[PDB]
Amino acid sequence: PSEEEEYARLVMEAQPEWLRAEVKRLSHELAETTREKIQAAEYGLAVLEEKHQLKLQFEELEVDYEAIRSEMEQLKEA
Amino acid sequence: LVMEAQPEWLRAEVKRLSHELAETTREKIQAAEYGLAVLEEKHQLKLQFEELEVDYEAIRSEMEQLKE
Amino acid sequence: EGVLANFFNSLL
């Protein structure tokens, strides 16, 4: 029997004291994973924002580069 | 009376939490894999930014060198 | 990338 059918048999045939402990155990597991899920989504928004700022900082540098390069090209007529 | 014949509620709770825990784990993993992808993207972009900085300095110093 | 931020907020 796989671990899954063995667990299914446990739940449908174990005593209430066991069922109550599993309920408790899964409640801790779900609370912890919900905490980790939330921190992952915050991490994502933070790095998404850092990336956004970096993109603006980049495009800003692109404009400053073009201005200088534009001027230089003009100068090579002298 | 003997509503106490209630392991059917416990059993319902075990299965509810098991499913919620599975979806919360998918969402968590999915979230984490997206976080990694942004880090990868930001890394490529940081590399490109520092390239442009260098080239920017290259032609700020190559002009100014235009000196008369 | 608005899809990522939407997914991220939907988890909060």
Residue numbers in the entry:
A (entry chain A): 4 to 81
B (entry chain B): 13 to 80
C (entry chain C): 441 to 452
From the reporting publication:
Dynein is activated for long-distance processive movement along microtubules through interactions with its general cofactor, dynactin, and one of many so-called “activating adaptors”. The activating adaptors (hereafter referred to as adaptors) fulfill multiple roles; they mediate key interactions that stabilize the dynein–dynactin complex, recruit cargoes, and regulate dynein’s activity and processive motility. Here, we structurally and biochemically characterize the interactions of LIC1 with two adaptors, BICD2 and CRACR2a. Crystallographic analysis shows that the LIC1–adaptor interaction has a conserved hydrophobic character, with the amphipathic LIC1 helix displaying a nearly identical conformation and its hydrophobic face embedded in a hydrophobic cleft in the three adaptor subfamilies.
A 2.4-Å resolution structure of human BICD21–98 in complex with human LIC1433–458 was determined ab initio using the single-wavelength anomalous dispersion method from crystals of selenomethionine-substituted BICD21–98. The electron density map reveals residues P4–A81 of one chain and L13–E80 of the other chain of BICD2, and residues E441–L452 of a single LIC1 helix. The uninterrupted coiled-coil segment of BICD2 comprises residues P19–L78, displaying the characteristic heptad repeat. At the N-terminus, one of the BICD2 chains is disordered, whereas the other chain contains an additional helix (residues E6–E16) that runs antiparallel to the coiled-coil helices. The LIC1 helix binds near the middle of the BICD2 coiled-coil segment and is oriented diagonally with respect to the axis of the coiled-coil. Critical to the formation of this pocket is the presence of highly conserved alanine and glycine residues in the CC1-box that, based on the structure, can be more precisely defined as consisting of human BICD2 residues 39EKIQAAEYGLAVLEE53 (where, bold letters indicate residue conservation ≥50% among 100 CC1-box-containing sequences). In particular, residues A43 and G47 occupy “d” and “a” positions within the hydrophobic core of the heptad repeat and, because of their unusually small size for these positions, they help create a cavity for the binding of the LIC1 helix. The presence of a single LIC1 helix bound to BICD2 in the structure is surprising, since previous analysis suggested two binding sites. However, the second LIC1-binding site, predicted to be symmetrically positioned on the opposite side of the BICD2 coiled-coil from the one observed in the structure, is masked by a crystal packing contact. In contrast, Y46DZIP+/WTZIP− bound a single LIC1 helix (N = 1.1) with KD ~ 6.2 μM. These results conclusively show that BICD2 and likely other CC1-box-containing adaptors have the ability to interact with two LIC1 helices and with similar low-micromolar affinities.
